[PDB]
Every structure is written in C-alpha cells, then in structure tokens.
Amino acid sequence: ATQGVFTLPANTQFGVTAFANSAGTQTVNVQVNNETVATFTGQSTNNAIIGSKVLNSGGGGKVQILVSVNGRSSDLVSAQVILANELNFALVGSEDSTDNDYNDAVVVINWPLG
Amino acid sequence: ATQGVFTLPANTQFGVTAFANSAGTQTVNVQVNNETVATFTGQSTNNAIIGSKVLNSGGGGKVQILVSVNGRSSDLVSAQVILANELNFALVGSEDSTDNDYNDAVVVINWPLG
Amino acid sequence: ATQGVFTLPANTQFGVTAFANSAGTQTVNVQVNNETVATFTGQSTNNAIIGSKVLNSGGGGKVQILVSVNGRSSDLVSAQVILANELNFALVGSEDSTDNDYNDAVVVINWPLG
Amino acid sequence: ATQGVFTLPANTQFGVTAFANSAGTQTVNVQVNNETVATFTGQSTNNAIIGSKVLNSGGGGKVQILVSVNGRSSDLVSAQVILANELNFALVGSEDSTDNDYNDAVVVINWPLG
Ligand SMILES: Cc1cc(C)c(S(=O)(=O)NC[C@H]2O[C@@H](C)[C@@H](O)[C@@H](O)[C@@H]2O)c(C)c1
Ligand SMILES: Cc1cc(C)c(S(=O)(=O)NC[C@H]2O[C@@H](C)[C@@H](O)[C@@H](O)[C@@H]2O)c(C)c1
Ligand SMILES: Cc1cc(C)c(S(=O)(=O)NC[C@H]2O[C@@H](C)[C@@H](O)[C@@H](O)[C@@H]2O)c(C)c1
Ligand SMILES: [Ca+2]
Numbered sequence: 001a002t003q004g005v006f007t008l009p010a011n012t013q014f015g016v017t018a019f020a021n022s023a024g025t026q027t028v029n030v031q032v033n034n035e036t037v038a039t040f041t042g043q044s045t046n047n048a049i050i051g052s053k054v055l056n057s058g059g060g061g062k063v064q065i066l067v068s069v070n071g072r073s074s075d076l077v078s079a080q081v082i083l084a085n086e087l088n089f090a091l092v093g094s095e096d097s098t099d100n101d102y103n104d105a106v107v108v109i110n111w112p113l114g
Numbered sequence: 115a116t117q118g119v120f121t122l123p124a125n126t127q128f129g130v131t132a133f134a135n136s137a138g139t140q141t142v143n144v145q146v147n148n149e150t151v152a153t154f155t156g157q158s159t160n161n162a163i164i165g166s167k168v169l170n171s172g173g174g175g176k177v178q179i180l181v182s183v184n185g186r187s188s189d190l191v192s193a194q195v196i197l198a199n200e201l202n203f204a205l206v207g208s209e210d211s212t213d214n215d216y217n218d219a220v221v222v223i224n225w226p227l228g
Numbered sequence: 229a230t231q232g233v234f235t236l237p238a239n240t241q242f243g244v245t246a247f248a249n250s251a252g253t254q255t256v257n258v259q260v261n262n263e264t265v266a267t268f269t270g271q272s273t274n275n276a277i278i279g280s281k282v283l284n285s286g287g288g289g290k291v292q293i294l295v296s297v298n299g300r301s302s303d304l305v306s307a308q309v310i311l312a313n314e315l316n317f318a319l320v321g322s323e324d325s326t327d328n329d330y331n332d333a334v335v336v337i338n339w340p341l342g
Numbered sequence: 343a344t345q346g347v348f349t350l351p352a353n354t355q356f357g358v359t360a361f362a363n364s365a366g367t368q369t370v371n372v373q374v375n376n377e378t379v380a381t382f383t384g385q386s387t388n389n390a391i392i393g394s395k396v397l398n399s400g401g402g403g404k405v406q407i408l409v410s411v412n413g414r415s416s417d418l419v420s421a422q423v424i425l426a427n428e429l430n431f432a433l434v435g436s437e438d439s440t441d442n443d444y445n446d447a448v449v450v451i452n453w454p455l456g
C-alpha cells in the first residue's frame with residue numbers, strides 16, 4: 001500500500017518533526033499538494049530531532065512524507081490516530097535496511113496548533 | 115479512565131518529546147516507575163518543542179505523563195499505536211483552563227531507538 | 229475528555245458492531261447527528277456480537293456511542309485510527325464495574341463500505 | 343513491511359472478526375504460532391460479517407492474518423492500538439484489486455475477553 005500520505009483539513013497549520021535512529025544519513029522530504037515544502041537531513045542513532053517545522057496544508061490538504069538514504073528510497077509504514085475527536089497525529093516509520101525496526105527515520109505530524 | 119500511563123518493555127530506551135500550544139506555561143512531568151525523571155517547562159502558541167530527551171523504562175517499564183499549568187492539573191487523553199508490530203508511539207494530549215483543546219501540551223513517546 | 233464521539237465524512241455508509249464481555253446486560257446506543265438510530269442489547273462473557281448494522285452518517289457526520297448497563301452509564305475510552313489514508317476505524321471500550329478491563333461492551337465502527 | 347502480524351500476550355483469549363466489502367469472495371486465514379486455527383470465507387459488498395471466533399494466543403503469542411481471493415494474496419495494511427493501557431485492538435485492511443479502498447476484507451482482533 002502507499003504509505004506516508006495524509007489528508008489534512010484544508011489551509012491548516014500543522015507541525016512536522018523528524019527523528020533519526022540509524023547509521024545512515026536520513027533525507028526526509030515533506031510535500032504539500034505534490035510540492036516539496038521542507039527537507040530535513042540528518043544523522044543520529046539516538047533519536048535526535050533532525051527537523052521540526054510549522055507548515056500549512058494548503059488548499060488540497062495533501063501531506064506526503066518521503067524518506068531516502070544516499071538516494072535510495074526507504075520503505076515506509078504509517079497511520080493516523082485521532083484522540084478526543086480533535087487531536088491528530090500522522091505517524092511515519094521508515095526502514096533503510098533489513099532489521100525492520102522502522103525507526104531509521106521517524107516522522108510525527110501534529111495538528112491542530114495554537 | 116486513567117490516561118497518560120503506558121507499559122513499555124523493561125530496560126528500554128525511549129524518546130519523549132513535548133510540544134506546546136497554549137498561552138499558559140506548561141509543566142510536563144515524566145515519571146518512570148513512579149519517580150519523576152524529567153520535567154519540561156515551556157511556553158508557546160506555535161508548537162515549539164519544550165523538551166526532548168532519551169530515557170530508559172527501567173525495571174518496571176512504567177511511564178506516566180502528567181501536565182500542569184500554574185499548578186493546576188490538565189485533563190489528559192492518550193493512546194498507544196504500534197506499526198509493523200515493532201514501532202511504538204505513546205501519545206498524550208492535554209487541556210488546560212486557557213484553551214479547551216487537547217493540544218495545549220502534546221507529548222510523543224517513541225521506541226525503539228538506535 | 230468526552231469519549232465515543234467521532235466525526236465521519238458526511239452522508240457516508242458505515243458499519244457499527246458491538247461485542248460483549250461482562251456478566252451485565254449491555255446497551256449500546258448509536259446516535260447520528262444527535263439522534264438515536266440503533267440500539268444493541270445483549271449479554272455475553274465470551275465476546276458475542278450483540279449487534280452489527282450498516283448506517284449513514286447523515287449531513288453532519290456526527291456519530292456518538294453511549295454504553296449503559298441497566299440505566300447506569302459505563303465509563304468509555306475511544307480513539308480513531310486511519311490506515312492507508314482511507315480505511316477508518318473508530319473504536320470504543322467501556323467499563324461497567326471496577327476491574328478496569330474496559331471490554332464490557334466493545335464497539336467498532338468501520339468505513340468505507342462497498 | 344510485513345503487515346497483519348501481531349504479538350499478543352501469551353496464553354490469552356482473543357476475538358477475531360472479519361467483514362467483507364468486495365465483489366470477490368474473501369478467504370481470511372488466522373494463524374496462531376504458525377498454525378492455521380480459523381478460516382472465514384464469504385462475500386458481501388455491505389460489510390457482512392463473514393466470521394467471528396474466540397481463539398487463544400498460545401505460548402508464543404504470534405497472530406497472523408492472511409487474506410486471499412481465489413488464492414491470490416490481498417495486499418494488507420495493519421496496526422495495533424491500545425486504549426487505557428489495557429484494551430487492545432489489532433486491525434487489518436486488505437485490498438484485492440487496485441481501487442485501494444483496503445476494505446475488501448476487514449479484520450478486527452480484540453483482547454482481553456471476559
Ligand atoms: C551509512 C550506512 C551504514 C549502514 C551499515 C547502513 S545499513 O546497515 O543498511 N542500515 C542502517 C542501520 O543503522 C543501524 C545503526 C540501525 O539503526 C539499523 O536499524 C539501521 O537500519 C546504512 C543504511 C547506512
Ligand atoms: C457495579 C457492578 C456492575 C455490574 C455490571 C456488575 S455485573 O454485571 O454483575 N459484572 C460485570 C463484570 O462481569 C465480569 C464477568 C467481568 O466481565 C467484568 O469485567 C465485568 O465488569 C457488578 C457485579 C457490579
Ligand atoms: C485483480 C482483481 C481482483 C478482484 C477480486 C476483482 S473483483 O472481485 O471483480 N472486484 C473486487 C472489487 O469489488 C468492488 C465492488 C469494490 O469493493 C472493490 O474495492 C473491490 O476491490 C477485480 C475486478 C480485479
Ligand atoms: Ca533499520
């Protein structure tokens with residue numbers, strides 16, 4: 001299945017934060033309605049935050065996360081969870097190798113803000 | 115129901131990250147096995163990270179999040195989600211007197227690391 | 229926090245299914261835009277299905293689950309999870325007593341159908 | 343990633359229930375510690391329940407869901423969600439074609455029971 005794609009409400013501010021847990025340098029591309037709006041690049045094996053930004057979901061509300069390491073696309077896993085019918089988390093794990101921890105880059109998208 | 119309490123595997127490194135979205139200064143207390151091991155204090159209305167740490171779940175694996183503002187306990191909501199039977203997120207929202215949204219402090223716990 | 233309330237897309241068919249795990253007779257009321265549209269009643273300590281129906285979310289998309297035993301409201305926990313940005317589950321547990329298994333009536337709402 | 347695989351606590355009773363939403367006849371196989379222990383077969387485009395059973399997770403706790411249509415494996419999506427640190431849902435969607443609704447067979451695993 002396609003993973004790492006989420007529908008947000010239109011024209012909504014959201015947070016995106018990426019963590020790294022891999023010997024590989026992670027490149028996380030964030031697209032809003034099919035256009036790159038942020039790229040986070042970093043390396044950590046201890047969950048360092050490699051990027052955190054506030055963005056807007058735009059007219060179409062489409063947010064997509066892609067992850068690569070040295071030009072190779074990582075395999076993604078994702079889900080969205082909603083608490084109290086209002087607090088939203090869109091969650092991405094990614095795997096750059098064979099141990100299948102899916103923590104090599106982790107991305108958390110949260111809304112609403114404010 | 116009690117919220118903000120999670121059972122982790124024993125002796126496991128985990129990340130804890132807190133974001134703020136409130137006029138009130140948030141105090142986030144992290145307890146591991148019934149002892150405070152981290153306190154994040156900060157304030158933002160635009161999803162600033164008010165703390166990010168790597169902790170260990172210890173012998174018992176018990177992790178509890180409490181949130182207060184000006185000494186008053188915020189109301190919590192929480193859940194845990196597991197992706198690919200291995201990537202874990204424990205999620206907490208909190209609501210203070212100032213804004214009736216569970217985003218006033220948002221806490222994300224993630225494991226495994228490395 | 230209020231639990232058991234979910235916003236569905238408007239005018240959308242959804243499934244609602246309730247299971248029982250309690251000595252007490254469970255009553256599950258399903259309300260769509262603040263009107264009861266189905267009630268499931270039954271008793272089981274072995275996860276029997278006490279009702280399953282297809283409903284429509286109507287104009288407003290508001291779906292609320294209420295659980296009671298002999299007129300006493302149970303304590304509810306809930307969340308919504310979305311897979312592949314398309315398959316939705318709204319989940320409710322309920323506790324009618326003191327053991328805190330939260331499974332006394334369990335309700336699963338799923339969409340889309342077809 | 344390998345979807346539809348979940349680690350349950352050992353020797354635990356759990357419910358498994360499957361719904362169908364497809365023109366194709368769905369076969370759901372449930373494996374506990376690498377042995378098939380239940381099989382549900384049916385066809386519906388309106389979320390009919392094609393099976394529900396109570397099973398035990400055994401010593402290993404490994405539960406796997408496979409879905410096929412005329413012997414062709416469907417593509418799976420899955421996640422596990424825990425409410426109140428105690429009430430567990432393991433959730434599977436499946437796609438038998440390319441419209442990507444992931445509802446063609448929907449499987450819900452719940453525990454604890456009783
Ligand atoms: C730069 C580099 C080196 C290596 C060895 C790899 S890898 O082994 O294919 N994967 C990275 C690997 O890093 C470990 C520290 C651990 O976090 C694993 O889960 C992770 O997959 C890569 C990709 C890059
Ligand atoms: C205060 C209270 C309420 C109820 C409903 C009961 S009961 O119905 O007799 N027992 C509910 C109880 O049933 C067990 C078999 C188990 O499933 C529990 O999780 C469930 O709460 C009593 C006795 C008291
Ligand atoms: C590759 C492929 C497989 C299948 C099983 C079919 S089908 O059975 O003719 N149609 C499956 C299809 O049914 C629709 C009513 C809808 O529920 C779809 O989501 C579902 O996938 C085809 C045509 C092709
Ligand atoms: Ca890895």
Ligand SMILES: [Ca+2]
Nearest residue numbers: 021103104228
């Ligand atoms: Ca890793």
Ligand SMILES: [Ca+2]
Nearest residue numbers: 114135213218
């Ligand atoms: Ca707020």
Ligand SMILES: [Ca+2]
Nearest residue numbers: 328329330332
């Ligand atoms: Ca109970």
Ligand SMILES: [Ca+2]
Nearest residue numbers: 249329332456
């Ligand atoms: Ca019970």
Ligand SMILES: [Ca+2]
Nearest residue numbers: 438442443446
């Ligand atoms: Ca389909």
Ligand SMILES: [Ca+2]
Nearest residue numbers: 342363443446
């Ligand atoms: Ca379908």
